[PDB]
Amino acid sequence: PQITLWKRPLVTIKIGGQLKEALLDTGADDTVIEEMSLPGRWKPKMVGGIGGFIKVRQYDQIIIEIAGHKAIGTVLVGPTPVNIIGRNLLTQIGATLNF
Amino acid sequence: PQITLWKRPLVTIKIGGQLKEALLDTGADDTVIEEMSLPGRWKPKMVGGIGGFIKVRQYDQIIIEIAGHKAIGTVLVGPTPVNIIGRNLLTQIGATLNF
Ligand SMILES: COc1ccc(S(=O)(=O)N(C[C@H]2CCC(=O)N2)C[C@@H](O)[C@H](Cc2ccccc2)NC(=O)O[C@@H]2C[C@@H]3CCO[C@@H]3C2)cc1
Ligand SMILES: [Cl-]
Ligand SMILES: [Cl-]
Ligand SMILES: [Cl-]
Ligand SMILES: [Cl-]
Ligand code: NA
Ligand code: NA
């Protein structure tokens, strides 16, 4: 699809067996999802933005369906105010910014 | 252009006669720029990013060039770690997300 930017570019994702809404975010290096359980090992990380940093759990090799496109990668889990699909997974679905 | 996302989507902007680097950020509603001087009056605004809320100065109707495309619109000035071009100006340059 072609998604215009008049509105937030929200899509449905499936992660850990759960359907969620998430933002397609070219300004995010990494994918950051609100607190939920995921299987396997994790390690702590800090991620920073406007307003400062939050502590997250970094889970590697997590499969996420994004607008019906499968992608695998690292997912960060923590107290983000919105679910964010960052560049690490946008690349895998072939997303580009065009103007 | 068509911009892939394997690297950060950094572009040159021109504002107040000065070249700066900024991030094209589809997850940002608003354009937020590091401390600089801008003409005219400003209004208050609170911006809620990943780590919390910050105060910014809102300047309306500011001339800004983005990757060689001319925009005139709202710029927020405050302590962001990176200059970010949000959807209010991405729409002015005709940007879309495609996959
Ligand atoms: C390492 O991986 C990441 C690091 C930081 C973030 S981030 O969420 O902080 N952010 C990074 C950007 C903004 C600062 C910067 O230098 N780069 C991703 C953004 O798209 C973020 C994504 C976002 C975070 C929190 C709330 C909503 C969106 N949007 C955002 O901060 O927008 C600001 C806040 C205001 C709300 C939305 O628009 C307004 C302008 C995401 C992943
Ligand atoms: Cl970070
Ligand atoms: Cl990854
Ligand atoms: Cl590619
Ligand atoms: Cl505007
Ligand atoms: Na894992
Ligand atoms: Na003004």
Q: Please provide the DSSP assignment of B4-62 as one string.
A: -SSS--EEEEEETTEEEEEEE-TT-SS-EE-S---SS--EEEEEEETTEEEEEEEEEEE
Comparing C-alpha atoms, which of B52, B62, B50, B49 is closest to residue B88? B62
Helix (H, G, I), strand (E, B) or coil at A21: strand
Mutate which of A25, A33, A58, A97 to test ligand 1's pocket (most atoms within 8 Å of Cβ)? A25
Calpha distance A70→A72 (Å, rounded): 7
Calpha distance A49→A56 (Å, rounded): 13
Q: Are residues B3 and B24 in contact, defined by beta-carbon separation less than 8 angstroms?
A: yes
Q: How many structural domains comprise chain B?
A: 1
Q: Copy the structure tokens of residue A78.
A: 């923590």
Q: What order do you get walking across the sheet with B96-98 strand by strand?
A: A2-3, B96-98, A96-98, B2-3
Calpha distance A81→A78 (Å, rounded): 9
**CATH code of the domain containing B10:** 2.40.70.10
Residues of the domain holding B49: 1-99
Tokens 């770690």, located at residue: B81
Tokens 């019906």, located at residue: A68
| Residue A8 burial class via C-beta count within 10 angstroms: exposed 0-12, middle 13-18, buried 19 and up | middle
> CA-CA-CA-CA torsion for B25, B86, B44, B55, nearest 10 degrees?
0
Q: Are residues B25 and A25 in contact, defined by beta-carbon separation less than 8 angstroms?
A: yes
Residues 39-78 of B with CB under 8 A from A: 47-54, 67, 69
Q: Copy the structure tokens of residue B81.
A: 């770690």
Q: Which helix (H) or strand (E) holds A18?
A: strand A18-24
Going from the Cα of A62 to the center of ligand 4, the distance in angstroms, rounded, reads 21
CB B74 less than 6 A from any atom of ligand 1:
no
Task: Record the resolution, in angstroms.
Answer: 1.2
